[PDB]
Amino acid sequence: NLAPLPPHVPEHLVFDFDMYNPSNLSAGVQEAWAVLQESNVPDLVWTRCNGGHWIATRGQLIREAYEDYRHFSSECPFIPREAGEAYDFIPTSMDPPEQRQFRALANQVVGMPVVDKLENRIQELACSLIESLRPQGQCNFTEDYAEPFPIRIFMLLAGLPEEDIPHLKYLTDQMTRPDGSMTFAEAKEALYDYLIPIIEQRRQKPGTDAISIVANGQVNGRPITSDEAKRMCGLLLVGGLDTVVNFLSFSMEFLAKSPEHRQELIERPERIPAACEELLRRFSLVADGRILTSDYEFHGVQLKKGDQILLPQMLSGLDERENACPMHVDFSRQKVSHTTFGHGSHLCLGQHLARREIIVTLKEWLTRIPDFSIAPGAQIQHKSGIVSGVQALPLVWDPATTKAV
Ligand code: HEM
Ligand SMILES: CC1(C)[C@@H]2CC[C@@]1(C)C(=O)C2
Structure with missing residues (x-):
């Protein structure tokens, strides 16, 4: 289903890429998206899929667009347009200077100091989850660790019941990887x-949870409204439930297939941080966009007001002009360049939390289960969308090779 080409779009700039169902998905989602960086593809193209929109395919253009909020607004960040229009999360759907005030508040609940205080809890949960799996000799990583570990940590930070995870997770997934079951x-x-009800209660009887902090926060000298708190908490929910969860699976799938990389981290622990950055570059998984506020000529191409442009954060680090042999994983890269956590005024505030969860997982898993692989006959399948993911990841290992700690 391709939409008719708009009058201002030159035919030689057309490349029908479907971000929700790319062609080479079987080869891996990152590989599927990297086709946009082949020599036969211009730096800026127009796809007729999903209603029609532009796509910047180079790190330089992606960074530029993200820095220029004057022309590329966050007002309508999702594709298709219907999704971008219904999108009203704070502070991502706002442009500076308005954005700044809310961002400062959100930083209060997921910022560095919060991570520092939750460190011991993150470590306790990781160790507890892994030790319980260790003797089994097998697991479906996505549902046995990738989901419970980060989500339980967030539910703890938000003060929400664990029983609501299945419900909340489903709604979250429909927003990033639309099933077709429901509209955005x-x-x-x-x-x-x-x-709504929860925020109501937290306004009257505040607690120390993130939701109570947001609901009673102050913005621009005055107090936040119920509506503003609702829209900010909505964002925190999606970020806590559908980001780290998918990234861990990509990384573990890779480590399960590369004994040499596992060994490297086991023998030279001082390399884990560097490895984390490289994995964040190679397995980048986010792709959202902006909307043109007015007619604008961008790198020789004429964009029209109201035109939507996808600026795949995932492509910057895969761009060969930024990283030599982009598909190769090299923990000793002199320079790891990427925009996995974004760029510009909307740089991810939860990246400190994410990095902590990734590093703890790598260290604690390889300590107890240094040897593992993908189950024979299992076919790992990736899914594309605003946030890409892994359908399932069956792992196997010999318990005799594990180490209780
Ligand atoms: C590996 C995991 C993660 C990745 C790759 C990621 C990626 C991103 C990206 C690319 C953006 C910018 C979006 C845009 O410019 O339109 C962003 C924003 C944001 N992320 Fe993360 N994120 C991750 C984890 C988290 C977590 C754990 C939270 C916490 C709930 C979270 C909360 C936020 C917030 C608050 C913003 C909005 C900041 C603003 O608009 O000023 N993210 N993230
Ligand atoms: C693109 C994102 C990863 C970022 C945090 C959650 C997300 C889905 C948004 O809507 C903004």
Whole structure:
């Protein structure tokens, strides 16, 4: 289903890429998206899929667009347009200077100091989850660790019941990797139906949880409104439940296939941080965009007001002009360049939390289960969207080779 080409779009700039169902998905999602960086593809193209929109395919252009909020606004960040229009999360759907005030508040609940205080809890949970799996000799990583570990940590930070995870997770996934079950607007309504009552209670009887902190926060000297708190908490929910969860699976899938990389981290622990950055570059998984506020000529191409442009954060680090042999994983890269956590005024605030969860997982897993692989006959399948992921990851290992700690 390709939409008719708009009058201002030159035919030689057309490349019908479907971000929700790319062609080479079987080869891996990152590989599927990297086709946009082949020599036969211009730096800026137009796809007729998903209603029609532009796509910047180079790190230089992606960074430029993200820095220039004057021309590329966050008002409508999701594709298709219907999704971008229904999108109203704070502070991502706002442009500076308005954005700044809310960003400062959000930083209060997921910023560095919060991570520092939750460190011991993150470590305890990781160790507890791994030790319980260790003797089994097998697991479905996605549902046995990748989901429980980060989500439980977030539910703890937000003060929400673990029983609500299945419900919340489903709604979250519909927003980033649309199933077709429901429209973005409906998924958002449902999520808000859940939050409204909670925020109400937290306003009257505040707690120390992130939601209580957001609901009673102050912005621009005055107090935050119920609506503003609802829209910010909606964002925190999606970020906590559908980001680290998917990234861990990509990384573990790779480590399961590369004994040499596992050994490297086991023998030279001082390399884990560097390795984390490289994995964040190679397995980048986010791709959202902006909307043109007015007619604008960008790198020789004429963009029209209202035109939507996808600026794949995942492509910057895969761009060969930024990283030599981009598909190769090299923990000793002199320079790891990427925009996995974003670029510009909307740089990810939860990246400190994410890095902590990734590093702890790598260290604690390889300590107890240094040897593992993908189950024979299992076919790992990736899924594409605003946030890409792994359908399932069956792992196997010999318990006799594990180490209780
Ligand atoms: C590996 C995991 C993660 C990745 C790759 C990631 C990626 C991103 C990206 C690319 C953006 C910018 C979006 C844009 O410019 O339109 C962003 C923003 C944001 N992320 Fe993360 N994120 C991750 C984890 C988290 C976590 C754990 C949270 C916490 C709930 C979170 C909260 C946020 C917030 C608050 C923003 C909005 C900042 C603003 O608009 O000023 N993220 N993230
Ligand atoms: C693109 C993102 C990864 C970022 C945090 C959650 C997310 C889905 C948004 O809507 C903003």
